[PDB]
Design a binder for this molecule. Structure first.
Ligand SMILES: [Zn+2]
Lengths: 187, 224
C-alpha cells in the first residue's frame, strides 16, 4: 500500500552490496556484521557501502538510499531526524552522502526521505553515507531499528536493482556489534 | 504558544517511583510544569484514570505506577514528556508515535521491552484476588485486570472467610504472602494456578498472557 519494498532484487546487472571489514574494538567508527547483515556506526561518520555489479549499468543510472523501520508496527512510519537534531543537505534527512551531485528528495506523497547520486562504475564503486541521528534519539527513531534500502534505478526512476542492510547508529558500534552477535548465539 | 495546540487531547502524568529510577544499570521532567504547558494549549488534565478526547500518558521514562499499568492495560499510549517540549517549541503537534516510551523491564527477556500494539492480555479471564490490602491490592489490581479485559474479578480479603468462594469457577488466583493457607491447599487440589502481582505486571509489559510459572517472582509468596 505505502511501505516501500525491501525485497532483494539483484536484477539484470547482478547488483549486490559489499562492506569494508573492521574490528569489534570499542574504538571503531563503523563496523559491519555479516552474520546479522547489520551495520553499526556513530552519528555522522563515514559509512562505506559498496556497489557491486556483474554488468555495468548504462550511464544515467542512479543509486537511491532510503530508511524504513524494520518492525511491522512501525513500517508505515516515515523515518526522520528527531526535532532535537533538526534544529542544528536538508536538516530533516537522516541519511546523507559525503563527497557529489547528491540530490535530496522529499516524496510529496509518501513523505519519505531519500538521497540519490549518479551511479559511476568502479572492482566495486563505493558510496560514503552518514546517519545523522542515533537509533535511540527520543523523538526520532526512538530505539526502533531501521533498514537502509539501496536501489539502482534508471534515468527515469525505474527499478533496476535493490538491496538492504539493517542499521544501528550508536555511541559504541564495536561494543554493540559484539553484543548483538553474542545475543544471537543463544536464546 | 498557540492557545489551542493540545485542544482535543486529555492527559495523565506520572513520575517514575524511586525504585524505578533506582534500577539505573539493573530540562528534567516536571509534572507541574508540563501540566502548565498542556493547559496553556487547552489540554485537558486528568487527575486520575477514567470518548470525547484522545488520551495520552506523559512520563519521563517507563515506570511501574498505578497510572502506567492502567494505561498499558487500556491502550492509552505512554508518551515521553519531550513530545510536549518539541510541540510547544515548534508550536505544532508532533507525531507522538515517535516519542512512545518503552513498556517496561521484562523478566523473561531480561531487558527493557519496547511497546507494540497488543490484544487485551486478560481477555475473558476470570480471576480471584486474595489479599489483606483492601486498597493497594484488591482495589488496585481489580481495576487494572478489568480494564485489561478480564471477564470478572472476585475480590476476597485474606482475613475474611470462605463461605462463598467456589474456586473452581476461576482461571487464576492473583495474591500475595497474606494468602490464607486453606486457599493455597484448595487451589492445589483443584489445580488452580496461584500467582503474585508480578505475573499481572509482566503480562502488561510483555503485552500478552505469559507463563504462570515462567519465573520464580510469579510465586505468590516471593519475598526478597
Ligand atoms: Zn537525533
Amino acid at each position: 500500500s505505502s511501505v516501500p519494498s525491501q525485497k532483494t532484487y539483484q536484477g539484470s546487472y547482478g547488483f549486490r552490496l559489499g562492506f569494508l571489514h573492521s574490528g569489534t574494538a570499542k574504538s571503531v567508527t563503523c563496523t559491519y556484521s555479516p552474520a546479522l547483515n547489520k551495520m553499526f556506526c556513530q552519528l555522522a561518520k563515514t559509512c562505506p557501502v559498496q556497489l557491486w555489479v556483474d554488468s555495468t549499468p548504462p550511464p544515467g543510472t542512479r543509486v537511491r538510499a532510503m530508511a524504513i523501520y524494520k518492525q511491522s508496527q512501525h513500517m508505515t512510519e516515515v523515518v526522520r531526524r528527531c526535532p532535537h537534531h533538526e534544529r542544528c543537505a536538508p536538516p530533516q534527512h537522516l541519511i546523507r552522502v559525503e563527497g557529489l551531485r547528491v540530490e535530496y528528495l522529499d516524496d510529496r506523497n509518501t513523505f519519505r526521505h531519500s538521497v540519490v547520486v549518479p551511479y559511476e562504475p568502479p572492482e566495486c564503486t563505493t558510496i560514503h553515507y552518514n546517519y545523522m541521528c542515533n537509533s535511540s534519539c527520543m523523538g526520532g527513531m526512538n530505539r526502533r531499528p531501521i533498514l537502509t534500502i539501496i536501489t539502482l534505478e534508471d534515468s527515469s526512476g525505474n527499478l533496476l536493482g535493490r538491496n538492504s542492510f539493517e542499521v544501528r547508529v550508536c555511541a559504541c558500534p564495536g561494543r554493540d556489534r559484539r553484543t548483538e552477535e553474542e545475543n544471537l548465539r543463544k536464546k | 504558544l498557540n492557545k489551542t495546540l493540545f485542544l482535543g487531547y486529555a492527559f495523565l502524568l506520572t513520575m517514575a517511583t524511586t525504585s524505578d529510577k533506582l534500577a539505573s544499570r539493573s530540562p528534567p521532567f516536571n509534572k507541574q510544569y508540563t501540566e502548565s504547558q498542556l493547559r496553556a494549549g487547552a489540554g485537558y488534565i486528568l487527575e486520575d484514570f477514567n470518548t470525547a478526547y484522545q488520551c495520552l500518558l506523559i512520563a519521563d521514562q517507563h515506570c511501574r505506577t498505578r497510572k502506567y499499568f492502567l494505561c498499558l492495560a487500556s491502550g492509552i499510549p505512554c508518551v515521553s514528556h519531550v513530545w510536549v517540549h518539541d510541540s510547544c517549541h515548534a508550536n505544532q503537534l508532533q507525531n507522538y508515535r515517535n516519542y512512545l516510551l518503552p513498556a517496561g523491564y521484562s523478566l523473561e527477556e531480561q531487558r527493557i521491552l519496547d511497546w507494540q500494539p497488543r490484544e487485551n492480555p486478560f481477555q475473558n479471564l476470570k480471576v480471584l484476588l486474595v489479599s489483606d490490602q483492601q486498597q493497594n491490592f484488591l482495589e488496585l489490581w481489580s481495576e487494572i485486570l478489568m480494564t485489561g479485559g478480564a471477564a470478572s474479578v472476585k475480590q476476597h480479603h485474606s482475613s475474611a472467610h470462605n463461605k462463598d468462594i467456589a474456586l473452581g469457577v476461576f482461571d487464576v488466583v492473583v495474591t500475595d504472602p497474606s494468602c490464607p493457607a486453606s486457599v493455597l491447599k484448595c487451589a492445589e487440589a483443584l489445580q488452580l494456578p496461584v500467582v503474585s502481582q508480578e505475573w499481572v505486571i509482566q503480562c502488561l509489559i510483555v503485552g500478552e498472557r505469559i507463563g504462570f510459572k515462567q519465573h520464580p517472582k510469579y510465586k505468590h509468596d516471593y519475598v526478597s
